[PDB]
Design a protein around this nucleic acid. Structure first.
Ligand SMILES: [Ca+2]
Lengths: 378, 371
DNA sequence: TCCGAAATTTCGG
DNA sequence: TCCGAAATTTCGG
């Protein structure tokens, strides 16, 4: 179970929020996200790949006892989409002032807009009281046209708490078709994201970056590559010995020039296998911290398989990454591969952290005007 | 060489039956389908994508010694079109009573009509002595309008023999423009067709499904996808080694939710790569059975505009599928990539059957009113 | 006579 | 990467 006064972060690539509610035990919960969140005993939850539409936000955006922040594509339906939910504790709770949401933002670039008046619209970069900040040079040749296109697929939601913690929930592109246009989009997204994180860290923000990064960081987290190199997994807790016996191949997995995204992602992890990780990384893999590097077969995705978790198959591309200043707060971190309903499994981590501000305009009830989703609309 | 009890099935996406007669050796046959069928020594033949018109049926629908069953669009000329031809054996032949055509049908839904009199027509679903059967719930919400729309492009011809064999000749939609409405039409056509196959199989018919399915079943039948995954082909007979090293991509190819037509086609294949194919599928890929899964680059279509036929870079979308009840009959099966005349190549399979009547009204002489 | 539940087969990933 | 969810077939008062 979870401790009494810790915040449980939960990430889950549901691969269709409507479809995941068709599996036990969630099929018994009448499509109630509140029942799901109480089932996992979670307080800050992010769901990636919602595959939803604006009409359905009247259901996923109103959760009793929670704040809802949801980002979907502007026009394309049933594609991508990220949601983040912050539990509202009671006034007599010690984490009441900590879990106060002071800001909320959509995207990584800051060029996305929020309703400002009748026909007016202002982006997050121009409003310092609503934008979280850290937009200082995310890319060398980044104009508004490319930044809006980079944020056009509903892949990021940002939430800032009163205790100075910025939660960044991402569903990074995967480039599943192996195209040149898709690979450049993937690399540009990752570089802008990690740069945005580095900017917020210099300002002094405690950063929790979690979600589906679609990047494998170490060789031991790739069932396909371990079979390609004929490396047998005999000891389920023999990860350190495997990385010592195959030190050369473990490093080649990261710095492989055919896969620069693996190198870019490792360059921000302080606990990376690269020797100079502690001199350049600022984020810590919470799951690898608690489970250690000995645990093998610690996979969070089994592509296209929602009903079974086969052996010798799968990867780990779902993470909960925290700033160095939050390493001393990690009390628990694991995965839940027995949960069915998606080709991904949930990942959770418990952190011990221990005037009024209006609700941010990006809250789902305001961003999507849920008070008007009535009969003619539905 | 073939025995006396051997039946040669042949399928060919001619892509314009008039244009296919321009190439060797068919240009010296004076546009005689009888000469073409004798050239292949074939007994049951289906040509897809005829691109003909009602005026020209008087030639393609009157083949000496053959029954002719041709389906074309109602109004659109030079588009789609399917034809099936059954050889009429002599009375001194052991397969004379087996090759008797007892029924014939147009389309997959049965909602199409047939001539009955003067200003009065009846569909195949209402007449039991003309319809083949198996119409029981082919789709959840299928009305008369959407079904006739599904059978409006002349893409299917069904023929039932006296020995219980039902030959289904199809030219399934391809969705070339890659539109949302076209993908739904393709998916609904493929679902209704395969459901009609399972219904006729439960009734007890020995089904032979052949034609242009426009769907790749396995990764090894797609030069495009093999190059996308950066899978080189060195040994032309190393299909088992390729599928073993790339087992993940081979299975993800079948169950990929982004390409559901590949999943739907696989569920009816008894020889599908999935673990439950033996209990779940009812059809056998004759070409894959005889050529085995080792033969790579067994393509039946190539992009002519990109000149990919010389290098044998293409796909296999043309099949001859048979019921499990006909499994022990398959004596030979191969593709014929050396035959010119189209951007596809023919496919054949030999079945040993080893086992008068009024001609159906859908025959070409009755359906299109021939003198 | 509608109703539903167990048993069974088929489906999608 | 076989497995749970969906559909259907069966059974009976
Ligand atoms: Ca709780």
């Amino acid at each position: 179970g979870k401790s009494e006064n810790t915040i449980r972060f939960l990430t889950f690539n549901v691969n269709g929020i409507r479809t995941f509610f068709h599996y036990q035990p969630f099929s018994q919960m009448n499509q109630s996200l509140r029942s799901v969140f109480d089932f996992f005993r979670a307080d800050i939850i992010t769901f990636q790949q919602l595959k939803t539409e604006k009409l359905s936000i009247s259901k996923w955006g109103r959760v009793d006892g929670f704040y809802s922040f949801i980002s979907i594509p502007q026009t394309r339906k049933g594609y991508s989409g990220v949601g983040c939910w912050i539990r509202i504790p009671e006034k007599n709770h010690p984490l009441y002032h900590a879990l106060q949401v002071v800001k909320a933002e959509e995207g990584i670039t800051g060029y996305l807009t929020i309703k400002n008046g009748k026909h007016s619209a202002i982006s997050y970069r121009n409003d310092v009281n609503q934008g979280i900040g850290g937009y200082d040079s995310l890319d060398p040749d980044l104009d508004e046209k490319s930044a809006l296109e980079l944020d056009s697929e509903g892949r990021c939601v940002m939430v800032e708490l009163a205790c100075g913690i910025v939660i960044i929930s991402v569903y990074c592109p995967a480039n599943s078709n192996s195209s040149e246009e898709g690979e450049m989009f993937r690399l540009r997204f990752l570089k802008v994201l990690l740069r945005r994180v580095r900017n917020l860290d210099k300002i002094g923000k405690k950063i929790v970056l979690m979600g589906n990064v679609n990047v494998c960081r170490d060789l031991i987290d790739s069932a396909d590559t371990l079979e390609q190199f004929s490396i047998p997994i005999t000891d389920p807790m023999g990860g350190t010995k495997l990385e010592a016996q195959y030190r050369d191949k473990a490093i080649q997995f990261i710095i492989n020039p055919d896969t620069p995204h693996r190198r870019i992602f490792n360059q921000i992890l302080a606990d990376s296998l690269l020797p100079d990780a502690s001199k350049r990384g600022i984020l810590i893999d919470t799951t690898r911290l608690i489970q250690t590097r000995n645990r093998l077969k610690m996979y969070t995705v089994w592509n296209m398989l929602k009903n079974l978790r086969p052996s010798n198959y799968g990867s780990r591309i779902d993470f909960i990454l925290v700033s160095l200043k939050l390493e001393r707060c990690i009390k628990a971190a694991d995965i839940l591969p027995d949960i069915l309903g998606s080709d991904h499994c949930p990942v959770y981590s418990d952190l011990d952290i221990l005037t009024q501000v209006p609700i941010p305009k990006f809250e789902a009830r305001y961003k999507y005007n849920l008070r008007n989703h009535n009969v003619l609309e539905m």
